Amino acid sequence: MIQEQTMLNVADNSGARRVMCIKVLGGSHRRYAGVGDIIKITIKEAIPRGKVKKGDVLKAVVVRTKKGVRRPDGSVIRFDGNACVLLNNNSEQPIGTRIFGPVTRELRSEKFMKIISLAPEV
Amino acid sequence: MRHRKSGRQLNRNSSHRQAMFRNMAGSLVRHEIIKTTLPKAKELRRVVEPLITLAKTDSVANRRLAFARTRDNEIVAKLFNELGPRFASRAGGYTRILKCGFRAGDNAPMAYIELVDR
Amino acid sequence: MIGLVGKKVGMTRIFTEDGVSIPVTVIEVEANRVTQVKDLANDGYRAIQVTTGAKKANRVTKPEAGHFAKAGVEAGRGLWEFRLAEGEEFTVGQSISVELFADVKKVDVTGTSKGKGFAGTVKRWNFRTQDATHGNSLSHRVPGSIGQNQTPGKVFKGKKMAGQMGNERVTVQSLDVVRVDAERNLLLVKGAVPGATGSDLIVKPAVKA
Amino acid sequence: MTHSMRL
Amino acid sequence: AVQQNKPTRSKRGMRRSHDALTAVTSLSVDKTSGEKHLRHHITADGYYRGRKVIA
Amino acid sequence: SNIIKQLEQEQMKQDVPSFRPGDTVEVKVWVVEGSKKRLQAFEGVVIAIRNRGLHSAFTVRKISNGEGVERVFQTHSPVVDSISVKRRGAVRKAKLYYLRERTGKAARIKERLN
RNA sequence: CGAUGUCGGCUCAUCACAUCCUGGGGCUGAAGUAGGUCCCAAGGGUAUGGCUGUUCGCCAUUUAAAGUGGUACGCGAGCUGGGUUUAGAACGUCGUGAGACAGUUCGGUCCCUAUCUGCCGUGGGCGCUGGAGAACUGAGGGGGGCUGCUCCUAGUACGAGAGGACCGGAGUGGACGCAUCACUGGUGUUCGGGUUGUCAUGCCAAUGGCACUGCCCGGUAGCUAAAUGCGGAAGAGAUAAGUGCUGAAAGCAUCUAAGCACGAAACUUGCCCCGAGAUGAGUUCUCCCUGACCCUUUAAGGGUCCUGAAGGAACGUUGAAGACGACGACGUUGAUAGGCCGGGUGUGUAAGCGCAGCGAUGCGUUGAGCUAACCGGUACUAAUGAACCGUGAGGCUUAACCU
RNA sequence: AAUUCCUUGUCGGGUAAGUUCCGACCUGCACGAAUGGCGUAAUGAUGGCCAGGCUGUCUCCACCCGAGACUCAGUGAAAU
RNA sequence: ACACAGGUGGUCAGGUAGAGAAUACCAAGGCGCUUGAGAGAACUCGGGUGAAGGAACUAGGCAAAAUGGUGCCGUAACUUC
RNA sequence: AGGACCGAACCGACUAAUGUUGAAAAAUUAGCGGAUGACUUGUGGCUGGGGGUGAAAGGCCAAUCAAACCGGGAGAUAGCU
């Protein structure tokens, strides 16, 4: 249940290490975001050879939560630690080449299909 | 909002309520008939009657559970020696509630509660 | 058309073969029997009146006993009435099973919900609790300002305040029906219907197409 | 104690 | 919280009208004692439905 | 009551294997990718089982490549294909939430050999 | 001026239109897309943060939009008290000095048990013209009305390309309201276990008290949201602006003077809830009473004896009803509550005994033992026989009616 | 600047965004040398700001345990 | 002013764990605080726990949560050493 | 050794809550500061009203302090209600 001021860990190799969500997008007074949701983030820590530096502001997509998705059978998939994958702020394609850790199945639509094409497990 | 909640609070905290039901069960098994307030009598049914259900079969560990529940030795002696076989044949309903006027002092709904052999 | 009354007996869920686990509610729809048919002659409008269940003969009174012995129908607990929409009729005493609801696809439920009792405004009208600290004094969950000032000089009619919440008749519309069992006298609807288990759910075909 | 009082 | 001006004997009497204590309807006559008691309570001397339960 | 448990006795599946909490289990789930379906494996450790008849569930915990995942399963659902125990654990607590806490050598547990 | 408590924030708001979005139209220097300007329109909706005591503003980032105003610059017998505006202290400055400053800085008691109106709920009385029990009609009142994205239409009409629709169809989202725990969860001091200290049951073993439930670990039923279902309509009428058809007055022309037809989330219905105290007190069905006297102010009379029917009330067991009254179930031709039994559930292999080990401890008996509010049964206890209220056919006039 | 009106001076740092904080420059309304000037380790229930940890402060409240509130019996006020 | 949760100087001071006259539970010894009974609404007071997020609340982390003992290892700028 | 450190008694009174016709005309509860001293306290003295006392607030001087209380000038005076 990612809302504003939430710290997220990065999932890809874009060059970030630890970011902070600053706004959930889509609709007014929207409280929080689920796994298939785009959120705006700012970057708090980064590796120095990254494609993004500390203090940027750009979009991101959630990929993992501790609250977890809910499959239609009644199943729920609750990870450990929330995760995001950074997006090219206007073009919404990802930055990094690869992706660490598994993702969710419900994500699967064309831009996030480009996300899952790198992903190791589902 | 107590939808299908059972158990009466009786304006007492839970540890006092537990020790009070222990003392009342002791006096009821010893003297075989007492006079007490009506909701106290109803929850005394709800406490006492599993002890006389426990007392049907004489063993060691069941007497240790009786000593865990009521914490006295003469009470469990009188229980497992007398009220075990005296209530052998029946099933349920060992306590009997008659309501007997009101308390003169604070106007409390009073009731004689007894064991049905007497 | 004509609704059916039944007993809300718990909730469960069914499994489709594809994978969707649909949470359903089981209404024991006992077969209703009409006991009075209204018509335009005495009343100006047409309607039927049904009953179901069973009742002790000591528990009925002589008025309702005469009303049930008027036309061939045994005593049943409660009475209900349905409006018989213009092109449908019955002989008095003609029993209704749950096959007319086997024809239908979208259904709606009316029933008396659970009673939360005297509820405060946070439970009742979805208010907002005030700040629990920073100096707040004896005013955590109270509604606050209930009017303007001297220029109205009155609380308006229909102010949202605390009071009775629940034990009222309320409805759910356009529920999906999944399975209409014949021999067990059952109906299964998708999702939540009002009332605690043992309620009298009066079920109609849904008006919203 | 000023807060009520109108100065 | 303070009252504004004092009400009358009527507005006091109207509010005190609802405090009318009603009585019991009638006492039960016992079978064997003949004594009066309340319904579903024992008598003053101890009989209750013909059963001397406290003696 | 009785009618609800009759329907749920009808809908239940017959060969569920009983396992204690703490056994490493191999759970195979049907996965549907649109027009095609597949059988997909999930190996982990059960940490919590809830028996309610048809509402029976059990939550298997698997650390994948870096990260702990903890996924619940409805037992008599038609989606979960088969339940195969890999080894029989020997914990005594009924629920195992410190496996959600701990990592590594602390998160490893005993085998039963009862 | 024998007191109308100030700015700002929180909670709750309600109205106006000079309308920010959504809706309808005119013109456009409107090819399309997107705009500009003006007319109609108040049903609904209307940011989150950083700085500041701030309203305001600037910024960052959303949105369909970040409306303008009234309401004691709404709201302190609802909350706060940061600012201003008490007594302390200080800097600059002015003053010979006490002191002073729409200059600053640090610190600085927010009282009240609601009489009446109002509002939210819920009852007692009588009424409704013999009494009683149900089920409805509906005057009237109230609730709700927001909308994005994607896809089809289609890459079509349009245009040099670049870009790219009106109208209609479909799915999926947000914010809001209602309902319910079947799922995922929270709580679950009434269930089970682990454990430190200490005391007690004579002692070992086993338990119990107390230390915030001693600290923790799980957790049934309930309640609950972050969970799951649902709802904004479609249709219809009379329309606002607007566009019209025919048509004179006024040989022509013209939406209008006579007439006829379209036209908006507004109004009236359609959906939902209350609702015959709707004193205009409504309707339909069923049930229950078919005795005598006296008296005079012969009256819609007062009284006496006999009879008390339908049903209500009282009491008891009580309820996912409930502040209390109320409402719902049940009262032995009886499962209403308690208990018992079978089960379910939760906790995790009880105690005792044996065996191994010097010992803590372990293993077999053992998935044992204990299980709240759960389930299905079971008259074992507690719902007593009666007494209480309510009676005796229900006025007058006119009219039809059947004899 | 406890001093600065204009003023949220301009530049730099910190923040996604900083009228407060820190470092600067002097255009000191109206600093300035025992009505002391400028420094300063330690100290402070002292003032301003920042970060880590921790959380029901909050998004958004939910359940529970006790004490009053409510009903019954006894005594029985006050402001107005 | 009350049979008032306030104030009042000296002497003795036991057991177990403890550094201790703190604390936890006890002995001697003394009390259960001069109104009770039900019910288990809102609301307030005292507390407990909480999913995901962790100062987004706000005047301001106010209040809460958290840290807490003994020994050993190690410990920076700056300094009046 | 220390106007040294942590911390009970003791002395205080920084924060929040409850109190506001209280339990109390200044408190209680949970935290807080000092705790071998410029400390605290028991008993008995002394200083007094334009005076005392003051590590200085115009603070305290018997719940009264920019001049105590009590009696007396006094039935002050009041262009004011």
Ligand SMILES: CC[C@H]1OC(=O)[C@H](C)[C@@H](O[C@H]2C[C@@](C)(OC)[C@@H](O)[C@H](C)O2)[C@H](C)[C@@H](O[C@@H]2O[C@H](C)C[C@H](N(C)C)[C@H]2O)[C@](C)(O)C[C@@H](C)C(=O)[C@H](C)[C@@H](O)[C@]1(C)O
């Ligand atoms: C212990 C209880 C005391 O009251 C309080 O402490 C409350 C909390 C004060 O507010 C405090 C605190 C505060 C900030 O105001 C609440 C402050 O300004 C006033 C002076 O004192 C009150 C209410 C003041 O009223 C206010 O007085 C203002 C002059 C006018 C104002 N009115 C016009 C609106 C009025 O409400 C005032 C004078 O003390 C009231 C008079 C009756 C009293 O003197 C009485 C003897 C009180 O002392 C008291 C009852 O014992």
